[PDB]
Structure 1
Amino acid sequence: AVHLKMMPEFQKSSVRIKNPTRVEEIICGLIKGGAAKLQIITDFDMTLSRFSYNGKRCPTCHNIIDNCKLVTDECRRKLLQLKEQYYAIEVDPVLTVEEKFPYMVEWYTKSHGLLIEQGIPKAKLKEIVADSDVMLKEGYENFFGKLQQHGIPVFIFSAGIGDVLEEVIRQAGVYHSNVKVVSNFMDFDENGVLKGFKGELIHVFNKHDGALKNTDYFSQLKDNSNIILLGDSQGDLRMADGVANVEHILKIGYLNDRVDELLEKYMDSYDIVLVKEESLEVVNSILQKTL
């Protein structure tokens, strides 16, 4: 039987849970299925990576490029201005999520377009990532390590920049075979210089679309009917829409900011909400019982 009361990781004050009995029953199902039924579906930015260090916000994959030696101060000025106008739409309490779709498409297209003008070479990405301020959440080596040890599928589904994300995990030593990355990947010209992005855009609000356009992945994993989902946004709740069959799904949400405004809604939609939390110890504690 599962008792969150007896799990020290769940006693941390950042752990917020509306329905602990329900959560205990989901984790109970996860444990019963063991490795053979488990898969992970996860966002990256601010979910696997830290939201902040020392009251200095940490970079998203996109910020890593925004901030690198290859990008001019004037470019960052424009990027900032984009962010200020479009982020106000993102968080607008009056617009429906569907109304925000076109605005999100513009923001990501305009900001990608400014990066494309700056001339980013594939060969520089290693240096850029090494020099950046990126940080993975505390407990990431045990997270990725237990999962790879047991061959648990991990589907990292990111509205960031795929090439940057992959380079971060590769340098961390955690880009193992069990880890599949679906993101916005760079398109490179004859000289290995960024010229655009591949595929259809993934942004914060359309992850349902991408989840459905990955049937190949999920149909191979028909038996993995127990899911752990990790996200930092309401949008990440859709990352599991492509899953073949679902027996148990546990949804863990990082609430990194706009805490007072969003806490109720997060507690309502995620099973476990982690408030201003920079570790993976709750999820690692669940893996520990399960694997």
Structure 2
Amino acid sequence: AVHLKMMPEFQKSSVRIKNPTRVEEIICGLIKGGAAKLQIITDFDMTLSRFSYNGKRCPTCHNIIDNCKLVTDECRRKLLQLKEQYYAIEVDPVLTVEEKFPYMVEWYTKSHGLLIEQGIPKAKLKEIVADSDVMLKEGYENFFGKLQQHGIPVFIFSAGIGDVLEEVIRQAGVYHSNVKVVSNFMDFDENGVLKGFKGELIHVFNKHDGALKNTDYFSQLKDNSNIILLGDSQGDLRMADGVANVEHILKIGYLNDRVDELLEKYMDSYDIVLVKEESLEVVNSILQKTL
């Protein structure tokens, strides 16, 4: 039997849970299925990586390139203007999420277009990442470690930049064979210089589309009918839309900012809400019981 009251990780003040009885029954099912039935579906930026550090906001994978030595101050000025204009639409309470779709396509196309003009070589991504301020959430080594030990499928589905994300986890020593990355991947020219992005754009609000376009992955994992989903946006809730069969799914959401505005909505839509929480200890505690 599962009792959250007796799990110390669940007593942290960052832990908000609307329906603890329901959470216990989902976790109960996760434990029952063990390793053989488990898979993880997660975004990257601000979920696996930190939102802030020492009162200073940490970079998204996109920001790692924005802030690097290969990008000029005038470009960063334009990237910031794009962000100020378009982020206001992202967080706009009046527009429906569907209405925000074209605006997100514009923002990401325009910001990716600014990076392309700056001339980013593939060979420099290692240095750029090593010199960046990116941080993984506390407990990432045990997170990735226990999962790889038990061969648990991990699907990292990111609206960020796939090449950057991959370099982050590679340098962290946690890009193991069980980890599949679906993101916006760079397209390089004959000289190994960024000229564009591959495939269909993934942004904060269209992850449903990509979830369905990964049938290959999810049908291979038909038996993995128990899911742990980790997100930090409302859009991350769509990341399991491609899952073959669902027996139990637990949804854990990092609420990193806009806390007063979003808390009620997060508590209604995620089973577990982690408020201004920079660790993976709650998910790790569930894995400890399950694996």
TM-score normalised by L of structure 1: 1.00
Shift of 1:134: 0.3
Shift of 1:49: 0.2
User: SS of 2:92's equivalent?
Assistant: coil
CA distance in 1, matches of 2:128, 2:178: 26
CA distance in 1, matches of 2:86, 2:73: 20
CA distance in 2, matches of 1:244, 1:97: 26
User: SS of 2:59's equivalent?
Assistant: coil
TM-score normalised by L of structure 2: 1.00
CA distance in 2, matches of 1:90, 1:60: 16
Gaps of 5+ in 2: none
User: SS of 2:196's equivalent?
Assistant: strand
What pairs up with 1:62-141 in 2 under 5 angstroms?
A: 62-141=62-141
User: SS of 2:187's equivalent?
Assistant: strand
1:256 lines up with 2:256 in the alignment:
yes
User: SS of 1:187's equivalent?
Assistant: strand
User: SS of 1:158's equivalent?
Assistant: strand
Shift of 1:158: 0.0
Shift of 1:201: 0.1
Shift of 1:110: 0.1
CA distance in 1, matches of 2:52, 2:88: 21
Shift of 1:3: 0.1
Shift of 1:135: 0.1
CA distance in 2, matches of 1:222, 1:231: 22
Shift of 1:11: 0.1
**Alignment coverage as a number of residue pairs:** 291
CA distance in 1, matches of 2:220, 2:211: 14
Shift of 1:66: 0.1
Shift of 1:148: 0.0
Structure 1 runs of 4+ aligned residues shifted over 2 Å read none
Shift of 1:117: 0.1
Q: For 1:231-286, what per-residue CA distance to the aligned partner results, in whole angstroms no more than 9, with x for missing partners?
A: 00000000000000000000000000000000000000000000000000000000
Q: For 1:80-139, what per-residue CA distance to the aligned partner results, in whole angstroms no more than 9, with x for missing partners?
A: 000000000000000000000000000000000000000000000000000000000000
* Identity level (%): 100
CA distance in 1, matches of 2:9, 2:61: 28
CA distance in 2, matches of 1:246, 1:181: 21
CA distance in 2, matches of 1:283, 1:259: 21
CA distance in 1, matches of 2:173, 2:74: 35
User: SS of 1:40's equivalent?
Assistant: strand
CA distance in 1, matches of 2:264, 2:257: 13
CA distance in 2, matches of 1:206, 1:120: 26
CA distance in 1, matches of 2:134, 2:162: 15
User: SS of 2:94's equivalent?
Assistant: coil
User: SS of 1:252's equivalent?
Assistant: strand
Q: For 1:43-85, what per-residue CA distance to the aligned partner results, in whole angstroms no more than 9, with x for missing partners?
A: 0000000000000000000000000000000000000000000
